[PDB]
Amino acid sequence: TRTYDGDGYKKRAACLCFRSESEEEVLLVSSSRHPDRWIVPGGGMEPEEEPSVAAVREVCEEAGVKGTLGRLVGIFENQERKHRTYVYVLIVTEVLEDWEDSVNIGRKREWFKIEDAIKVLQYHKPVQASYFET
Ligand SMILES: O=P(O)(O)O[C@@H]1[C@@H](OP(=O)(O)O)[C@@H](OP(=O)(O)O)[C@@H](OP(=O)(O)OP(=O)(O)O)[C@H](OP(=O)(O)O)[C@H]1OP(=O)(O)O
Ligand SMILES: [Cl-]
Ligand SMILES: [Cl-]
Ligand SMILES: [F-]
Ligand SMILES: [Mg+2]
Ligand SMILES: [Mg+2]
Ligand SMILES: [Mg+2]
């Protein structure tokens, strides 16, 4: 069930999943519709779901990782697609081998240096590239 803010924007949550507290390498996942493209793992908030809870759940489902939830980086609008995403830091402490989206849709995951994550996100996901702006 998709949820919406009062202005009709779809409610989403995502994490920047870092390998360590140095926040130098981030985990991206493949697009479902276009597997040759990279995205930041995230998705729709459920009814009455706290954004931090949705972020952690979506990262588990799409990236198959768990870790220590850190700060809210910010709330990011995509005007073109009419969605609003809460973006958190997550420091990865558990990497699971057979996760929901790997089993169900063959979703891939890969570590990127921050500069390279920004580069691969720019063309199709410029708002996601902006999550790393600080
Ligand atoms: O079709 P796009 O390229 O506009 O993006 C797709 C994106 O596909 P992707 O970014 O993977 O190409 C999906 O993401 P996902 O299939 O990788 O999960 C994403 O879904 P979402 O991440 O908001 O939703 P859920 O993760 O499932 O909760 C949205 O799909 P949905 O809203 O039909 O569930 C999104 O569509 P819009 O909200 O219209 O932008
Ligand atoms: Cl790191
Ligand atoms: Cl986006
Ligand atoms: F999902
Ligand atoms: Mg999802
Ligand atoms: Mg998603
Ligand atoms: Mg979802």
Annotation marks residue 50 as catalytic = no
E-only strand ranges, the chain: 10-18, 25-30, 38-39, 42-44, 65-78, 83-95, 109-113
Task: Provide the 10 A C-beta neighbour count for residue 2.
Answer: 12
Domain ranges of the chain: 1-134
What residues contact residue 41 under an 8 Å CB cut-off, 6+ apart? 14, 15, 17, 27, 28, 29, 58, 59, 62, 63, 109
- Closest residue (by CA) to atom 26 of ligand 1? 43
> Quick one: which H or E segment has residue 51?
helix 51-63
Q: Give the residue whose CA is nearest to atom 37 of ligand 1.
A: 81
Report the atom number in ligand 1 closest to the C-alpha of 105: 16
Using most ligand atoms within 8 A of CB, pick from 33, 60, 80 the residue to mutate for ligand 1: 33
Q: How was this structure determined?
A: X-ray
CA distance 67 to 126: 26
Say if residue 125 carries a ligand binding annotation.
Answer: yes
Resolution as reported, in Å: 1.5
